[PDB]
Design a protein around this motif. Sequence first.
Motif, PDB file in Angstrom:
ATOM      1  N   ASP A  93       0.866  -1.175   0.000  1.00 33.42           N
ATOM      2  CA  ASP A  93       0.000   0.000   0.000  1.00 33.42           C
ATOM      3  C   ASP A  93       0.906   1.228   0.000  1.00 33.42           C
ATOM      4  N   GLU A 115      -0.464   3.945   3.187  1.00 31.91           N
ATOM      5  CA  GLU A 115      -0.054   3.657   4.563  1.00 31.91           C
ATOM      6  C   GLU A 115       1.336   3.031   4.642  1.00 31.91           C
ATOM      7  N   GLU A 167      -6.000   3.954   0.142  1.00 35.04           N
ATOM      8  CA  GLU A 167      -5.111   2.841  -0.145  1.00 35.04           C
ATOM      9  C   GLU A 167      -4.725   2.922  -1.613  1.00 35.04           C
ATOM     10  N   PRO A 172      -2.961   0.028  -3.594  1.00 34.68           N
ATOM     11  CA  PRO A 172      -2.277  -1.269  -3.710  1.00 34.68           C
ATOM     12  C   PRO A 172      -1.467  -1.327  -4.992  1.00 34.68           C
TER      13      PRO A 172
END
Length: 392
Positions: A128, A131, A387, A389
């Motif tokens: 991610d 974060e 997020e 990804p």
Amino acid sequence: PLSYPFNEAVALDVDPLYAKLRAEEPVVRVSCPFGEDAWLVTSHADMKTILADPRFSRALAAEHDESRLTPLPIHTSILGMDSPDHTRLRRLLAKVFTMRRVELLRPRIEQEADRLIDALIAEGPPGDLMEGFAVPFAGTVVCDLLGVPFEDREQFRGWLDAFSATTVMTEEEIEADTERLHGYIAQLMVRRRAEPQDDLISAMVKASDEEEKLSEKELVELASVLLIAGHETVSSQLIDSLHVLFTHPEQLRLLKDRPELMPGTVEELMRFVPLISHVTFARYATEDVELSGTLVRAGESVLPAIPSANRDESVFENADRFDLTREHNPHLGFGYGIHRCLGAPLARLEMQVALDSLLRRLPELRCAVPAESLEWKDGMQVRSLLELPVLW
Ligand code: HEM
């Protein structure tokens, strides 16, 4: 009067109305979610006027029910002042927040980006980038510079939204969380006054104490905005910029092949990313001023829609296009004039180090889901992903 915002911000889509307004009616009367009605300003040229012309005041907002999108007026410290009080804080801050201090952070900033990528690789894909990179990267960098312990992020991070929330927090929660942050910094200041470190809170306390330049509350509120700008604004712009790059793969391949383009790339990202969700903070006219055919009378407020100015086709050719080779880029993403971003040298260092590090260490970086699946953080004054990804 049109109800503003016209539409809630979606991902990084720009509301087509702004281009319509720029072409047909660049200044328009609106009612605001809170406070007085205002004039929405959309054009690059008018943006420079309301941001830098002395006929427009930030401090006069305090004598109004300030036109705004947040339930309460924000404690914007230096960004809510005019001369002379603004000059006073700008000077103290400039004197301690020097270009030399920032440039000397470069080895630590580069090391932190490498350490974050080390952990991403150790933990395995998918990572991610929010974060697991942008948030802790911006956080550790501003925490190091300011002197707010990063280890306290679990306490303070929860109070930051109060400074930015539009629809999602009540007055009561905004006040409480604002008090908590202010009181947290005040305690930090007692330690740093008695036990200075190499950080901005210590330098500010020293300069203020040895010249009685600033009150304790002014120091608290000023350090608070610096924490927010370093923690929230930098990580928001960075994650948003990664989204732009993944969603314009051709420009990403170019940057990877021509890393000397990075400085112009960061500037184009500052322009193209519609970071501010709608407008920055309102100004009030001290006298009548005409803007793009609309008379703004003395005592009336203007909302500066900086992202719309950065899409002004009369200033940027193909302003709706992302082109990291763009040479002419007088963007207003760092503001303009008296309140222009004092953090811009630091933000540009961070943007450049972060993007170069990820592309050098992770040549195959790509977004792991389709754009449609991404979750954005809504109800704030800047846009950001929750997020991102990624694969490598
Ligand atoms: C990508 C990250 C950032 C962006 C996009 C950004 C953007 C801006 C903008 C547009 C303004 C002017 C706002 C207005 O006139 O209404 C501003 C002002 C300001 N910024 Fe930033 N900023 C960033 C990072 C930072 C950082 C890292 C710091 C310090 C740690 C900082 C400190 C300030 C301060 C103190 C002001 C007010 C200056 C004054 O009133 O004289 N910013 N920023």
